Amino acid sequence: NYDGTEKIPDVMPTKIPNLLVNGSSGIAVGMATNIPPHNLTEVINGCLA
DNA sequence: ATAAAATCACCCGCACAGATTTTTTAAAACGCGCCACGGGATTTTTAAACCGGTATTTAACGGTGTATGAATCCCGTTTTATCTTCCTTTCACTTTCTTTCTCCAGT
């Protein structure tokens, strides 16, 4: 952490494709993102395919 | 000094609706000119009124069976009369800045 007295995970070991099913939206310097949500069953079927 | 409840400015990308701002275009206008058109004075011809008569074609009249016009009752629409308001304006007051007049200690 900032004081060097704790530990924080670098990334989560997720079982869910969260990015596609929930989307995202943010504004940065020189760029931006905009992603719509989706349906979980269709994403799972696509991953299996 | 402990409790209860509230409010606002800016940064970073991107897409779009709305508000100016040039730019182009069609209508209105002006000056000059010429010839198409209408006025005036003869020739010509034909549309309609007038006499017949005849042969149809219409309107006024007497029964039935409706469709609608005036009256009543409402509710959205638009006018008109009637309140409050923010900028213009001065203006007497207040405040604040600039120059001047002394004091005055020192030598």
Coordinates of C-alpha atoms (C1' of nucleotides) in Angstrom, one line a residue:
Chain A
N1 CA 0.0 0.0 0.0
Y2 CA 1.1 3.7 0.2
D3 CA 2.6 3.3 3.6
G4 CA 4.1 -0.1 3.0
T5 CA 2.3 -1.8 5.9
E6 CA -0.4 -3.8 4.1
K7 CA -0.8 -6.1 1.1
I8 CA -3.3 -5.7 -1.8
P9 CA -4.1 -8.2 -4.5
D10 CA -2.9 -7.2 -8.0
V11 CA -5.9 -8.8 -9.8
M12 CA -8.8 -11.0 -8.8
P13 CA -9.1 -14.7 -9.7
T14 CA -12.6 -14.3 -11.1
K15 CA -14.7 -17.1 -12.5
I16 CA -17.0 -14.6 -14.2
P17 CA -16.3 -12.6 -17.4
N18 CA -17.2 -9.4 -15.5
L19 CA -16.1 -6.9 -18.2
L20 CA -18.5 -8.1 -20.9
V21 CA -21.5 -8.7 -18.5
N22 CA -21.3 -5.4 -16.6
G23 CA -19.5 -3.0 -19.0
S24 CA -17.5 0.1 -18.1
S25 CA -17.3 3.8 -18.6
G26 CA -14.5 6.3 -17.8
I27 CA -12.9 9.5 -18.9
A28 CA -9.1 9.8 -19.1
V29 CA -6.5 12.2 -20.5
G30 CA -6.4 11.8 -24.3
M31 CA -8.8 8.8 -24.4
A32 CA -12.0 7.3 -23.0
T33 CA -13.9 4.0 -22.9
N34 CA -17.5 3.0 -23.3
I35 CA -18.7 -0.6 -23.1
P36 CA -22.3 -1.9 -22.9
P37 CA -23.5 -4.8 -20.8
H38 CA -24.4 -8.2 -22.1
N39 CA -26.2 -11.5 -21.0
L40 CA -24.3 -14.1 -19.0
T41 CA -25.6 -17.2 -20.7
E42 CA -24.7 -16.0 -24.2
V43 CA -21.2 -15.1 -23.0
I44 CA -20.7 -18.5 -21.4
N45 CA -21.9 -20.2 -24.6
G46 CA -19.5 -18.1 -26.7
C47 CA -16.6 -19.0 -24.3
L48 CA -17.4 -22.7 -24.6
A49 CA -17.5 -22.4 -28.4
Chain B
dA1 C1' -20.7 22.4 23.7
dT2 C1' -23.5 18.4 22.0
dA3 C1' -27.4 17.4 18.8
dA4 C1' -31.0 17.6 14.1
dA5 C1' -30.9 18.6 9.0
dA6 C1' -28.8 20.8 4.6
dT7 C1' -25.6 23.4 0.0
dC8 C1' -21.7 24.7 -4.2
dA9 C1' -17.2 25.6 -7.8
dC10 C1' -13.5 23.2 -11.2
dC11 C1' -10.8 19.1 -14.4
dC12 C1' -10.8 15.3 -18.1
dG13 C1' -13.6 13.1 -24.1
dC14 C1' -17.4 12.7 -26.8
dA15 C1' -21.7 13.1 -29.0
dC16 C1' -25.5 16.1 -30.3
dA17 C1' -29.3 20.0 -30.2
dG18 C1' -29.6 24.8 -30.7
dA19 C1' -27.9 29.7 -31.8
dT20 C1' -25.1 33.1 -34.8
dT21 C1' -22.7 34.1 -39.3
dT22 C1' -21.3 34.2 -44.1
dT23 C1' -22.6 33.1 -48.8
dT24 C1' -25.4 32.4 -52.6
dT25 C1' -29.8 33.2 -55.2
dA26 C1' -34.1 34.8 -57.0
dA27 C1' -37.2 38.8 -57.1
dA28 C1' -37.8 43.7 -57.7
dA29 C1' -36.1 47.9 -60.1
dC30 C1' -34.1 51.4 -63.6
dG31 C1' -33.0 53.2 -68.2
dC32 C1' -33.6 52.9 -73.3
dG33 C1' -35.9 51.4 -77.3
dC34 C1' -39.1 49.7 -80.9
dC35 C1' -43.3 47.6 -83.0
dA36 C1' -48.0 45.3 -81.6
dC37 C1' -51.9 46.9 -80.8
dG38 C1' -55.9 49.6 -80.8
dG39 C1' -58.4 53.9 -82.6
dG40 C1' -60.9 55.8 -86.7
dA41 C1' -63.1 55.5 -91.2
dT42 C1' -65.4 52.6 -94.8
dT43 C1' -67.7 47.7 -97.0
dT44 C1' -69.9 43.4 -95.9
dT45 C1' -72.8 39.8 -93.9
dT46 C1' -75.9 37.5 -90.5
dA47 C1' -78.5 37.0 -85.6
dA48 C1' -82.4 37.6 -84.1
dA49 C1' -87.2 39.4 -84.2
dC50 C1' -91.6 38.3 -86.5
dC51 C1' -95.6 36.1 -88.5
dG52 C1' -98.1 31.8 -88.6
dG53 C1' -99.2 26.9 -86.7
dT54 C1' -98.4 22.2 -83.9
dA55 C1' -96.6 19.0 -80.3
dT56 C1' -94.8 18.1 -76.3
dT57 C1' -93.1 19.2 -71.1
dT58 C1' -93.7 21.4 -66.6
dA59 C1' -95.7 22.9 -62.4
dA60 C1' -99.5 23.1 -59.3
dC61 C1' -102.3 19.7 -56.4
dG62 C1' -103.5 15.8 -53.2
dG63 C1' -101.4 11.8 -49.6
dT64 C1' -97.6 9.4 -46.5
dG65 C1' -93.4 8.8 -44.0
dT66 C1' -89.4 10.5 -42.4
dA67 C1' -84.7 13.7 -41.2
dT68 C1' -83.5 18.1 -39.2
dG69 C1' -83.6 22.9 -36.7
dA70 C1' -84.2 25.2 -32.7
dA71 C1' -83.6 24.7 -27.9
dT72 C1' -80.8 23.1 -23.6
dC73 C1' -76.6 21.7 -21.4
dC74 C1' -72.2 21.4 -20.8
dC75 C1' -66.6 22.0 -21.4
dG76 C1' -62.0 23.5 -23.6
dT77 C1' -60.2 28.5 -26.1
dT78 C1' -59.1 32.9 -26.5
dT79 C1' -59.6 38.1 -24.8
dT80 C1' -59.2 41.4 -21.7
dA81 C1' -58.7 43.5 -17.5
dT82 C1' -55.4 43.5 -13.6
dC83 C1' -51.5 42.6 -10.4
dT84 C1' -45.9 42.7 -9.6
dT85 C1' -41.1 43.8 -11.4
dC86 C1' -35.9 45.3 -12.9
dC87 C1' -33.4 48.7 -15.1
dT88 C1' -32.8 54.0 -15.5
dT89 C1' -32.0 57.8 -12.8
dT90 C1' -30.5 61.2 -9.6
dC91 C1' -29.2 62.6 -5.2
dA92 C1' -28.1 63.6 -0.6
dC93 C1' -24.8 61.0 2.3
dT94 C1' -20.7 58.9 3.4
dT95 C1' -16.2 57.6 2.7
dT96 C1' -11.7 58.0 1.1
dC97 C1' -7.8 60.1 -1.1
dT98 C1' -4.6 64.4 -1.7
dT99 C1' -2.7 68.7 -0.4
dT100 C1' -1.6 72.0 3.3
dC101 C1' -0.5 73.8 8.0
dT102 C1' 1.7 73.8 11.8
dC103 C1' 4.7 71.6 15.9
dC104 C1' 8.6 70.8 17.1
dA105 C1' 13.0 68.4 18.5
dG106 C1' 17.8 69.1 17.2
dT107 C1' 21.8 71.8 16.2

